[PDB]
């Protein structure tokens, strides 16, 4: 199923939107995970929140300026902290002459402009904000309350890691960027675009993830000095042209406001925002993730320090393999 690893798009009914884990399993039964990314369009009647009329006063404590260096589709990006500003102030800044989406004729044109001009006018991203815009009354696909087996991390081990098992908000503007990465511990992620302009995603099928890692070693000198998990640093930007020239299989898709994207374990992804927007995202897990969690690379230089023990997950959800697993641990 899904032999070509196409990004699949799902349209669950209201009845199918009641049980998150069940629907994820269904998607995988149709081969969705092979692409590394899927889109879920919610039932017509569903809404995340009644209104967004009163979000302009939210304070973005630490907006980040995203400074890219490089050329010809290959860049490194680093972040500079900027002064706090409200979402209202941020929206005004996003829409200002310096930062507004350039005039363009179509997606392909905007995409070319993104890659060609990435070093100019470093954009400001209101990223990694602890919080949620889902109404408490929204009981289906509420990112604050998905009820997956990832809940063991807090329940069993008392571990809370912001953004992993608590939700993040992202206020974006044109050119704001997520670099190539898998999730910490190779978890799934889910991302809901609440409002505003689109978000474009690139994804390499998990089966080809190692080829992306090899390419990153070829493109980024010194990337392995002192660390075996460079891409966990989330500093590498690599254009689709460069992926194509180097034979790395990938796909692209644009997420619109009101749509969910799910990334699957070890599905490398990267992308960018088209203009002012607001997304919310969180990690989650399933039983199928456990063996990925066991295998996940870990940064060994202190740059990317999100990690946790797999013990509780194997102990509780893989009881018949727990002794075998422990033997491999020592």
């Amino acid at each position: 199923q899904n032999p070509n690893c196409n990004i699949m798009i799902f349209h669950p009914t209201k009845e199918e939107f009641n049980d998150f884990d069940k629907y994820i399993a269904y998607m995988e039964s149709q081969g969705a995970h092979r692409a590394g990314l899927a889109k879920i369009i919610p039932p017509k009647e569903w809404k995340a929140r009644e209104t967004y009329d009163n979000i302009s006063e939210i304070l973005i404590a630490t907006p980040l300026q995203q400074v890219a260096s490089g050329r010809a589709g290959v860049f490194t990006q680093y972040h500079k902290k900027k002064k706090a500003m409200t979402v209202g102030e941020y929206r005004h800044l996003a829409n200002s002459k310096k930062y507004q989406t350039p005039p363009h004729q179509n997606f392909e044109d905007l995409e070319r402009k993104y890659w060609k001009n990435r070093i100019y006018n470093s954009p400001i991203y209101g990223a990694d904000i602890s919080g949620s815009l889902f109404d408490e009354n929204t009981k289906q696909w509420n990112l604050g309350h998905l009820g997956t087996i990832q809940d063991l991390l807090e329940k069993e081990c008392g571990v809370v890691i912001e953004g992993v098992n608590t939700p993040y908000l992202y206020f974006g503007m044109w050119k704001t960027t997520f670099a190539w990465h898998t999730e910490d511990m190779d978890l799934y992620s889910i991302n809901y675009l609440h409002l505003g302009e689109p978000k474009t995603w690139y994804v390499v099928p998990p089966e080809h993830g190692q080829r992306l890692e090899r390419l990153a070693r070829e493109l980024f000198p010194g990337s392995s000095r002192g660390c075996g998990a460079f891409l966990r640093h989330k500093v590498a930007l690599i254009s689709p042209t460069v992926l194509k020239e180097n034979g790395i299989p990938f796909n692209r898709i644009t997420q619109e406001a009101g749509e969910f994207m799910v990334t699957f374990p070890y599905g490398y992804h990267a992308g960018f925002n088209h203009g002012f927007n607001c997304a919310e995202a969180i990690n989650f897990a399933t039983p199928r993730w456990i063996d990925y969690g066991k295998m996940a690379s870990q940064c060994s230089c202190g740059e990317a320090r999100v990690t946790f023990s797999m013990d509780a997950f194997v102990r509780i959800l893989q009881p018949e393999r727990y002794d075998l697993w422990k033997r491999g641990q020592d």
Partner: peptide, 10 residues
């Protein structure tokens, strides 16, 4: 304390 991050600093 470790938390999910969009990228790297400095």
């Amino acid at each position: 304390t470790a938390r999910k991050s969009t990228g790297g600093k400095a």
